[PDB]
Design an enzyme around this catalytic site. Structure first.
Site, PDB file in Angstrom:
ATOM      1  N   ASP A  75       0.838  -1.183   0.000  1.00  0.00           N
ATOM      2  CA  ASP A  75       0.000   0.000   0.000  1.00  0.00           C
ATOM      3  C   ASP A  75       0.881   1.243   0.000  1.00  0.00           C
ATOM      4  OD1 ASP A  75       1.046  -0.304   2.559  1.00  0.00           O
ATOM      5  OD2 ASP A  75      -0.832   0.121   3.588  1.00  0.00           O
ATOM      6  N   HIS A  94       1.682  -9.167  -2.964  1.00  0.00           N
ATOM      7  CA  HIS A  94       0.540  -8.265  -2.807  1.00  0.00           C
ATOM      8  C   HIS A  94       1.081  -6.849  -2.669  1.00  0.00           C
ATOM      9  CE1 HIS A  94      -2.712  -6.173  -0.589  1.00  0.00           C
ATOM     10  NE2 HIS A  94      -3.527  -6.994  -1.224  1.00  0.00           N
ATOM     11  N   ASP A 107       0.742 -18.599  -4.100  1.00  0.00           N
ATOM     12  CA  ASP A 107       1.355 -17.493  -4.839  1.00  0.00           C
ATOM     13  C   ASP A 107       0.310 -16.738  -5.660  1.00  0.00           C
ATOM     14  OD1 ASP A 107       3.249 -15.699  -5.728  1.00  0.00           O
ATOM     15  OD2 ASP A 107       4.164 -17.057  -7.195  1.00  0.00           O
ATOM     16  N   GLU A 121       1.497 -11.242   1.321  1.00  0.00           N
ATOM     17  CA  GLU A 121       1.817  -9.921   1.835  1.00  0.00           C
ATOM     18  C   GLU A 121       3.328  -9.698   1.857  1.00  0.00           C
ATOM     19  OE1 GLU A 121       0.797  -7.122   2.121  1.00  0.00           O
ATOM     20  OE2 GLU A 121       0.405  -6.373   4.138  1.00  0.00           O
TER      21      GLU A 121
END
Ligand SMILES: [Ca+2]
Ligand SMILES: [Mg+2]
Ligand code: NA
Length: 432
Positions: A55, A356, A400, A409
């Protein structure tokens, strides 16, 4: 395993997490300037720092803890970083966040602890360079205390002073001055930062600040040798409780080990040994069939690499050294590929292809990047070199998939203990 390459790529992961005005010698070609408008409520420059995970929020609590842990590993395993040719790059790596903490400390008793609304931020999928949403900034202050966040940042700054004092005294002295001020703020304005900065509570909720007060005191005692800080460490520290883990929320075994080793304090050694034996085979942490110490489903690699780091610092100071080195090596080597695949993106055999992670999920400019890039069934277009993924389930299974926000993550704190542990293993190669 080529530890030199692992260290190089782990530091590249942190460089790929950089926010702000990137330097001319930026090594991550798909990253550019981003979040140049990050600022405090009176316009204070808040550019820089690291994006926390996949993020674009700047979460001060894990960002500081990752920096403290990275600095500690640079102090203890400098020889391994130097042998790998990565020592100057490691210093450059944490200089980035230390400079951010200086900016965020806008006055003696006010410290900016978050930039970005995590709800708004996580609703977006795209490049950081393409963000257009509001990015609010929140601070802790006497009316909005955060003893945990302030003392962890004080710890990172004092560790930074120790790392930099022999090469950049002006920088190091500035870090130490702010460490002292921030720690006084933490001690005298008491509360949980994620209650004062409530947007953080859904992501990095702090359960207690007393261990941060002991941790910041222990780092300031290492930095200054002033008895008052050792007194503060005993005041808020425990000699009777054993840490469950070492991580961004729980500093117990960190300050116990720091005080045992750097400060020569014998009262804390039994709890360090308890922690180690709890993590060793035969202890209280279950191991996956293929040998990963698996504390919980959320970032098991992170917890095990953090314990490996603690074990390797312990071994350096001749605390259960043989058992600590074997346990630590087993855990890092699981992550590097022992179970059949690497869990470090861009490294080794069949590394994870779908971390991610927004910026690496985007194709090269000028191509579009949006939620199509979240959903697309193939590898992230950019290789996020060095990122340690959350890891497998308790049966060593890993799909994956970018949508697997638990196992796939990546995060600043995931790599922090890992990177120091790798440097420690490199240093042991020099010793032997
Ligand atoms: Ca805590
Ligand atoms: Mg590319
Ligand atoms: Na620039």
């Amino acid at each position: 395993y080529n530890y030199d390459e692992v260290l190089e790529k782990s530091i590249l992961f942190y460089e790929a997490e950089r926010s702000g005005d990137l330097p001319a010698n930026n090594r991550i070609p798909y990253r550019g300037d981003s979040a140049l408008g990050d600022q405090g409520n009176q316009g204070q420059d808040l550019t820089g720092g690291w994006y926390d995970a996949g993020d674009h929020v700047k979460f001060g609590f894990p960002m500081a803890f990752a920096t403290t842990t990275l600095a500690w590993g640079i102090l203890e395993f400098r020889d391994g970083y130097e042998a790998a040719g990565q020592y100057n790059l490691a210093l450059d790596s944490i200089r980035w966040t230390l400079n951010y903490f200086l900016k965020a400390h806008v006055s003696d008793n006010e410290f900016y602890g978050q930039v970005g609304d995590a709800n708004t931020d996580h609703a977006y999928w795209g490049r950081p360079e393409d963000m257009t949403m509001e990015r609010p900034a929140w601070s802790i202050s006497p009316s909005a205390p955060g003893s945990d966040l302030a003392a962890e940042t004080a710890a990172a700054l004092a560790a930074g002073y120790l790392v930099f004092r022999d090469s950049d005294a002006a920088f190091a002295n500035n870090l130490l001055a702010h460490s002292r001020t921030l720690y006084d703020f933490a001690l005298n304005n008491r509360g949980i930062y994620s209650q004062s900065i409530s947007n953080a509570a859904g992501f990095y909720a702090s359960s207690a600040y007393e261990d941060e007060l002991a941790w910041g005191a222990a780092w300031l005692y290492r930095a200054t040798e002033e008895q008052e800080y050792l007194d503060r460490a005993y005041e808020f520290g425990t000699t009777t409780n054993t840490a469950w883990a070492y991580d961004w929320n729980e500093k117990i075994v960190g300050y116990q080990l720091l005080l045992t080793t750097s400060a020569g304090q014998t009262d804390f050694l039994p709890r360090v040994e308890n922690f180690l034996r709890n993590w060793f085979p035969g202890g209280s942490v279950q191991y996956t069939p293929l040998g990963l110490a698996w504390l919980a489903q959320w970032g098991p690699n992170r917890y095990a690499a953090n314990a490996a780091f603690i074990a390797l610092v312990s071994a350096k100071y001749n605390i259960l050294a043989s058992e600590s080195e074997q346990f630590a090596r087993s855990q890092i080597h699981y992550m590097l590929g022992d179970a059949g695949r690497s869990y470090v993106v861009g490294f080794g055999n069949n590394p994870p292809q779908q971390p991610h992670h927004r910026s690496s999920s985007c194709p090269d400019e000028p191509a579009e990047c949006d939620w199509d890039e979240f959903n697309q069934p193939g590898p992230n277009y950019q290789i996020l070199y060095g990122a340690l993924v959350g890891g497998p389930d308790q049966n060593d299974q890993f799909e994956d998939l970018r949508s697997d926000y638990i196992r796939n993550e990546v995060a600043n704190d995931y790599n922090a203990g890992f990177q120091g542990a790798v440097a420690a293993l490199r240093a042991i190669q020099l010793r032997d």
